[PDB]
């Protein structure tokens, strides 16, 4: 047995309990180290989220390849863009803090 | 007199490109049975003998009369006629299924999926069969309860939205429940490879716990709970 | 004949025929578990659109975050307008968060009965309203 | 001509019917190595074996120590000595072997502390040849035995290269000079006609319960294979013997199992008395089905009815523990609130004697071979077999023993497979059929497809169903039966003034049910005429004018100083029924009952005696 689809399902639930744990953790500790791990969790869970949406509505064998590649491209730009924001700007924790008291 | 209105889905494949249209039938409820099937039989026997439908046991234990009544997929011999005379009972076939005639769906794919899981006892050694009964305790026997009762009415699978869009590659609640039915069976030895047959994104993992399957089951069974229980076995089985 | 052959012969008889598909979404009864599943997918996509739009703007659009807030500050700061706009952020966020837990509870194999679905379905719905109104006043 | 497309299929064996006996015969032939085709008008699961709730009889010996030879005695005594004892020998001997066979297939039998199959008490079963008291040999899957039987038979059938003609209505047998060559059948999906030719043909179409108004049987139990043998000119056996199940709902006619009486359910009349102890002292309420239902219908005669209009009796489950009703009888518990609006734990079930079983059917050898009657002797019809309720190897005789039909299915279904496997080999010459064979079968179909008369199919059906219920009930007198005979004959002459509405090819339910009507009528004629001719009270057939049980000897007194009655004087013989299709003329003759067993040393022949529980 080569459980590829089984291990993928577990990973989705692993990042879910992680993302559920990180949101209050970011409120308690809004450090730079939290910013990158939150940017990693937001993108990965979101990528595997739309991945399930694509495999549901897209008919496949022709558009399936294009949609999965188009999503991977978007997810790569999202994670890099967020990492750029954490390094060259205030960070996603400080971004919310300033936005919410506006 | 006590008049009850029935609006039924009708399509004739012999009327040269006929459109699927609804047809209203009026029935004296005082001179009819309590169940929907009794009413469907009544219009067939009295009003119009053109309404085609599957019926057999009239008892609720064969799964022939399975159809969509008022937006719910149940057996017509189990669901009783709505006593409220001011409402018209909308009668449709099973959702997102190929219509052969009036309320008659093509279930060939449904049964084929049930064949693809291998619903029979598989032993590693078969040389000692048909001579001695296999042992099972009352404790191990109770684990099959609520699973073997499935009558294959195809109500739960046809209610599932995932089975609508992905009916070709996704097996559906009814079939998956039977796959689980042969998994926990203490007699069966091929438990590992039954799970290994579901190692693709479509066979099992197209379920998203929408939970329309349990909510419509005529026998009150819980396929969704059984599906989620498979998912737990899939992530824990070794080798 | 085999199971795989039965499926292959099924589609050839139906796709090349005059047989129509039975009505599905037009006729089926609206369930609370069904509607809440659609909203979970709706909020899922809406949130992923926001997260991606935020990271994508950090690369494409010029200027830092401090200057970007000033554009929002430029327009009249309506107390009843900012609160409503801020409410429309946490509303799809907290619904998906509370219902996300409900999905994770289901993955443990617990609370999968019809009465339990309707109970936990309301609890998630109520927690959303409270957490959305509560966080908008932070 | 040129209207219908004929598609000829070539196989080794054709099994008409996909029920219990049908599947066992079907998959067993491919398991033996034959190219087997299975023809069925319904999907195999929708078959009426699922409705079976009681159980399946086997002397395995799990509750107490048991012997299959006692199960032989209980069946032959139950058969009122009309049952062929060679067939009962074969059924009871490999009864434990064929049930273990099913459990090994995957059947989730109810269990005990030992871990073995749960057996229970049932109507008319006794240990130590009747003297030992109550017996427990009814193997059950918690009140859903027949449903679980069919699923584990169907499930196991996918292991083999069996062809399945799902939803194909069989019209007539393919016959050439007395020899059976296969089946001509109608496809329901598109409307075409298929000729399926094979060296051997098995018929497992079940009973004809739809002949009556009130029955526990399905809407499809129309004795199609029984009336298929009829049009071929071959006889039908014991068709007047119709079993009335004592416990059936007053409403839709649904079945409440005899397993209710086997667990501890008692029958109580409107007076409040335990009336079943009054009629039968030994077995009481758990007696044979020809005695219990006889007592219930007699309660109406003295006006002791429980119902609002005083017509039905009660089955009490008020005293039964709710712990047992959830584990041992869940199937009848849920269906009680549906059709009656009654919970089993606080109030009794409204029950009434209703049509249940047809022991009489197609004359059958203990091997499974279909028997024709020529010159007072039995002849085997070449390439024709029958198993199940449609068959009559007469293992049930005049009255079927409780929970014996599911056994009759698996054992004789297996026997039909073995008798083919040991006679001819797979791949042997398939006898060529005539180019225009089954011409009248197609011409028949074309008449009712374009039927333009005055009387509707369903209106003639109701006229048949209600006439049988009043004239051929539990009790029937010669004057009442004779009126019914000439009444059914008049209804047969109306089968040319029939009115149909549907004129399509794809799924014509208005046409197939009228074909069922042709089959039902031919079964009804032979049932009523065979009943009026029989001048005795034996088993389910009870004559009010002839209360006597007429045998070759007066078996009440010792057998020695008594001369034997001639064959055409006594009534301990099988009723063989022929009927001309064109005029509806019923002609009857009789063949001797088989008394000899397969081995006298291994199993003793039980002579006729006074029958009462
Ligand atoms: C009626 C009944 C019988 C019954 C019972 C409960 C009820 C309500 N409970 C039982 C029990 O608890 N224990 C037991 O031992 N027996 C019980 N019975 C009796 C027994 O179950 C029946 O006799 C049994 O169902 C008979 O089985 P069989 O396989 O011989 O017949 P069937 O199940 O009715 O299946 C018939 C099949 O034949 C096909 N068919 C019929 N006509 C055609 C034509 N026209 N063309 C093609 N195919 C045809 C049907 O498709 C069906 O599958
Ligand atoms: C992609 C990211 C784009 C940013 C936009 C997302 C804005 C939505 C955030 C919703 C959370 C509610 C905010 C609550 C709040 O007042 O901030 C916490 C604040 C209190 O300070 P304090 O110092 O604790 O205050 C003391 C007084 N209690 O400051 C913090 O502690 C920072 C914690 C913020 C973590 C939230 C991460 C949300 C990521 C989800 C992205 C969804 C996009 C749609
Ligand atoms: C921390 C709170 C969150 C939790 C507990 C959570 C959990 C989950 C779970 C368990 C699922 C799978 C549901 C199913 O079985 O179908 C899911 C779906 C999804 N989530 Fe999240 N999630 C959270 C936050 C987010 C965020 C912030 C995003 C935005 C990037 C997101 C995007 C998605 C998407 C696109 C799906 C797919 C929709 C679906 O298939 O139903 N989630 N979530
Ligand atoms: C009767 C209507 C409301 O019915 C519909 C219509 C459209 C979409 C849906 N709901 C989904 O489609 C859905 C929702 C959540 C998760 C997975 C799905 C999936 F898998 F794709 F089936 C239901
Ligand atoms: S699981 Fe329930 S709804 Fe689904 S086919 Fe079986 S009985 Fe019908
Ligand atoms: S409805 Fe469908 S997605 Fe689910 S839990 Fe049932 S299989
Ligand atoms: S007809 Fe058998 S389930 Fe309704």
JSON list of N, CA and C in Angstrom, two decimals, chain D residues 37-65:
[
{"chain": "D", "resi": 37, "resn": "UNK", "atom": "N", "xyz": [-26.51, -17.97, -17.39]},
{"chain": "D", "resi": 37, "resn": "UNK", "atom": "CA", "xyz": [-27.27, -16.73, -17.53]},
{"chain": "D", "resi": 37, "resn": "UNK", "atom": "C", "xyz": [-28.45, -16.72, -16.57]},
{"chain": "D", "resi": 38, "resn": "UNK", "atom": "N", "xyz": [-28.67, -15.58, -15.91]},
{"chain": "D", "resi": 38, "resn": "UNK", "atom": "CA", "xyz": [-29.77, -15.42, -14.96]},
{"chain": "D", "resi": 38, "resn": "UNK", "atom": "C", "xyz": [-30.75, -14.35, -15.43]},
{"chain": "D", "resi": 39, "resn": "UNK", "atom": "N", "xyz": [-31.99, -14.76, -15.65]},
{"chain": "D", "resi": 39, "resn": "UNK", "atom": "CA", "xyz": [-33.04, -13.86, -16.13]},
{"chain": "D", "resi": 39, "resn": "UNK", "atom": "C", "xyz": [-33.98, -13.49, -14.99]},
{"chain": "D", "resi": 40, "resn": "UNK", "atom": "N", "xyz": [-34.19, -12.19, -14.81]},
{"chain": "D", "resi": 40, "resn": "UNK", "atom": "CA", "xyz": [-35.02, -11.67, -13.71]},
{"chain": "D", "resi": 40, "resn": "UNK", "atom": "C", "xyz": [-35.75, -10.38, -14.10]},
{"chain": "D", "resi": 41, "resn": "UNK", "atom": "N", "xyz": [-37.01, -10.27, -13.70]},
{"chain": "D", "resi": 41, "resn": "UNK", "atom": "CA", "xyz": [-37.83, -9.09, -14.00]},
{"chain": "D", "resi": 41, "resn": "UNK", "atom": "C", "xyz": [-37.58, -7.94, -13.02]},
{"chain": "D", "resi": 42, "resn": "UNK", "atom": "N", "xyz": [-37.05, -8.28, -11.85]},
{"chain": "D", "resi": 42, "resn": "UNK", "atom": "CA", "xyz": [-36.65, -7.29, -10.85]},
{"chain": "D", "resi": 42, "resn": "UNK", "atom": "C", "xyz": [-35.15, -7.38, -10.62]},
{"chain": "D", "resi": 43, "resn": "UNK", "atom": "N", "xyz": [-34.60, -6.40, -9.92]},
{"chain": "D", "resi": 43, "resn": "UNK", "atom": "CA", "xyz": [-33.22, -6.48, -9.45]},
{"chain": "D", "resi": 43, "resn": "UNK", "atom": "C", "xyz": [-33.14, -7.53, -8.34]},
{"chain": "D", "resi": 44, "resn": "UNK", "atom": "N", "xyz": [-32.12, -8.41, -8.39]},
{"chain": "D", "resi": 44, "resn": "UNK", "atom": "CA", "xyz": [-31.96, -9.53, -7.44]},
{"chain": "D", "resi": 44, "resn": "UNK", "atom": "C", "xyz": [-32.27, -9.22, -5.98]},
{"chain": "D", "resi": 45, "resn": "UNK", "atom": "N", "xyz": [-31.96, -8.01, -5.51]},
{"chain": "D", "resi": 45, "resn": "UNK", "atom": "CA", "xyz": [-32.24, -7.61, -4.13]},
{"chain": "D", "resi": 45, "resn": "UNK", "atom": "C", "xyz": [-33.73, -7.38, -3.89]},
{"chain": "D", "resi": 46, "resn": "UNK", "atom": "N", "xyz": [-34.42, -6.85, -4.90]},
{"chain": "D", "resi": 46, "resn": "UNK", "atom": "CA", "xyz": [-35.85, -6.52, -4.80]},
{"chain": "D", "resi": 46, "resn": "UNK", "atom": "C", "xyz": [-36.73, -7.78, -4.74]},
{"chain": "D", "resi": 47, "resn": "UNK", "atom": "N", "xyz": [-36.11, -8.94, -4.95]},
{"chain": "D", "resi": 47, "resn": "UNK", "atom": "CA", "xyz": [-36.78, -10.24, -4.85]},
{"chain": "D", "resi": 47, "resn": "UNK", "atom": "C", "xyz": [-37.47, -10.39, -3.50]},
{"chain": "D", "resi": 48, "resn": "UNK", "atom": "N", "xyz": [-38.51, -11.20, -3.43]},
{"chain": "D", "resi": 48, "resn": "UNK", "atom": "CA", "xyz": [-39.34, -11.27, -2.23]},
{"chain": "D", "resi": 48, "resn": "UNK", "atom": "C", "xyz": [-38.79, -12.09, -1.10]},
{"chain": "D", "resi": 49, "resn": "UNK", "atom": "N", "xyz": [-37.62, -12.65, -1.26]},
{"chain": "D", "resi": 49, "resn": "UNK", "atom": "CA", "xyz": [-36.90, -13.30, -0.16]},
{"chain": "D", "resi": 49, "resn": "UNK", "atom": "C", "xyz": [-36.46, -12.34, 0.95]},
{"chain": "D", "resi": 50, "resn": "UNK", "atom": "N", "xyz": [-36.28, -11.06, 0.62]},
{"chain": "D", "resi": 50, "resn": "UNK", "atom": "CA", "xyz": [-35.92, -10.04, 1.62]},
{"chain": "D", "resi": 50, "resn": "UNK", "atom": "C", "xyz": [-36.98, -9.88, 2.70]},
{"chain": "D", "resi": 51, "resn": "UNK", "atom": "N", "xyz": [-38.24, -10.09, 2.32]},
{"chain": "D", "resi": 51, "resn": "UNK", "atom": "CA", "xyz": [-39.37, -9.95, 3.23]},
{"chain": "D", "resi": 51, "resn": "UNK", "atom": "C", "xyz": [-39.39, -11.02, 4.32]},
{"chain": "D", "resi": 52, "resn": "UNK", "atom": "N", "xyz": [-38.63, -12.10, 4.12]},
{"chain": "D", "resi": 52, "resn": "UNK", "atom": "CA", "xyz": [-38.53, -13.18, 5.10]},
{"chain": "D", "resi": 52, "resn": "UNK", "atom": "C", "xyz": [-37.92, -12.68, 6.40]},
{"chain": "D", "resi": 53, "resn": "UNK", "atom": "N", "xyz": [-38.61, -12.97, 7.50]},
{"chain": "D", "resi": 53, "resn": "UNK", "atom": "CA", "xyz": [-38.26, -12.42, 8.81]},
{"chain": "D", "resi": 53, "resn": "UNK", "atom": "C", "xyz": [-37.96, -13.49, 9.86]},
{"chain": "D", "resi": 54, "resn": "UNK", "atom": "N", "xyz": [-38.70, -14.60, 9.81]},
{"chain": "D", "resi": 54, "resn": "UNK", "atom": "CA", "xyz": [-38.59, -15.68, 10.78]},
{"chain": "D", "resi": 54, "resn": "UNK", "atom": "C", "xyz": [-37.20, -16.27, 10.91]},
{"chain": "D", "resi": 55, "resn": "UNK", "atom": "N", "xyz": [-36.82, -17.10, 9.94]},
{"chain": "D", "resi": 55, "resn": "UNK", "atom": "CA", "xyz": [-35.50, -17.72, 9.94]},
{"chain": "D", "resi": 55, "resn": "UNK", "atom": "C", "xyz": [-35.33, -18.86, 8.97]},
{"chain": "D", "resi": 56, "resn": "UNK", "atom": "N", "xyz": [-34.25, -19.62, 9.16]},
{"chain": "D", "resi": 56, "resn": "UNK", "atom": "CA", "xyz": [-33.90, -20.73, 8.29]},
{"chain": "D", "resi": 56, "resn": "UNK", "atom": "C", "xyz": [-33.57, -21.97, 9.14]},
{"chain": "D", "resi": 57, "resn": "UNK", "atom": "N", "xyz": [-34.29, -23.06, 8.89]},
{"chain": "D", "resi": 57, "resn": "UNK", "atom": "CA", "xyz": [-34.20, -24.26, 9.74]},
{"chain": "D", "resi": 57, "resn": "UNK", "atom": "C", "xyz": [-32.99, -25.14, 9.47]},
{"chain": "D", "resi": 58, "resn": "UNK", "atom": "N", "xyz": [-32.23, -25.42, 10.53]},
{"chain": "D", "resi": 58, "resn": "UNK", "atom": "CA", "xyz": [-31.08, -26.32, 10.47]},
{"chain": "D", "resi": 58, "resn": "UNK", "atom": "C", "xyz": [-30.82, -26.95, 11.83]},
{"chain": "D", "resi": 59, "resn": "UNK", "atom": "N", "xyz": [-30.68, -28.28, 11.84]},
{"chain": "D", "resi": 59, "resn": "UNK", "atom": "CA", "xyz": [-30.40, -29.02, 13.07]},
{"chain": "D", "resi": 59, "resn": "UNK", "atom": "C", "xyz": [-28.90, -29.06, 13.37]},
{"chain": "D", "resi": 60, "resn": "UNK", "atom": "N", "xyz": [-28.34, -27.88, 13.62]},
{"chain": "D", "resi": 60, "resn": "UNK", "atom": "CA", "xyz": [-26.92, -27.74, 13.95]},
{"chain": "D", "resi": 60, "resn": "UNK", "atom": "C", "xyz": [-26.63, -28.15, 15.38]},
{"chain": "D", "resi": 61, "resn": "UNK", "atom": "N", "xyz": [-27.58, -27.85, 16.27]},
{"chain": "D", "resi": 61, "resn": "UNK", "atom": "CA", "xyz": [-27.45, -28.20, 17.69]},
{"chain": "D", "resi": 61, "resn": "UNK", "atom": "C", "xyz": [-26.57, -27.23, 18.45]},
{"chain": "D", "resi": 62, "resn": "UNK", "atom": "N", "xyz": [-27.06, -26.01, 18.63]},
{"chain": "D", "resi": 62, "resn": "UNK", "atom": "CA", "xyz": [-26.33, -24.98, 19.38]},
{"chain": "D", "resi": 62, "resn": "UNK", "atom": "C", "xyz": [-26.99, -24.63, 20.71]},
{"chain": "D", "resi": 63, "resn": "UNK", "atom": "N", "xyz": [-28.32, -24.60, 20.72]},
{"chain": "D", "resi": 63, "resn": "UNK", "atom": "CA", "xyz": [-29.09, -24.34, 21.94]},
{"chain": "D", "resi": 63, "resn": "UNK", "atom": "C", "xyz": [-29.12, -25.60, 22.81]},
{"chain": "D", "resi": 64, "resn": "UNK", "atom": "N", "xyz": [-29.50, -26.72, 22.19]},
{"chain": "D", "resi": 64, "resn": "UNK", "atom": "CA", "xyz": [-29.41, -28.04, 22.81]},
{"chain": "D", "resi": 64, "resn": "UNK", "atom": "C", "xyz": [-28.88, -29.03, 21.77]},
{"chain": "D", "resi": 65, "resn": "UNK", "atom": "N", "xyz": [-28.63, -30.28, 22.18]},
{"chain": "D", "resi": 65, "resn": "UNK", "atom": "CA", "xyz": [-28.19, -31.31, 21.25]},
{"chain": "D", "resi": 65, "resn": "UNK", "atom": "C", "xyz": [-29.34, -31.71, 20.31]}
]
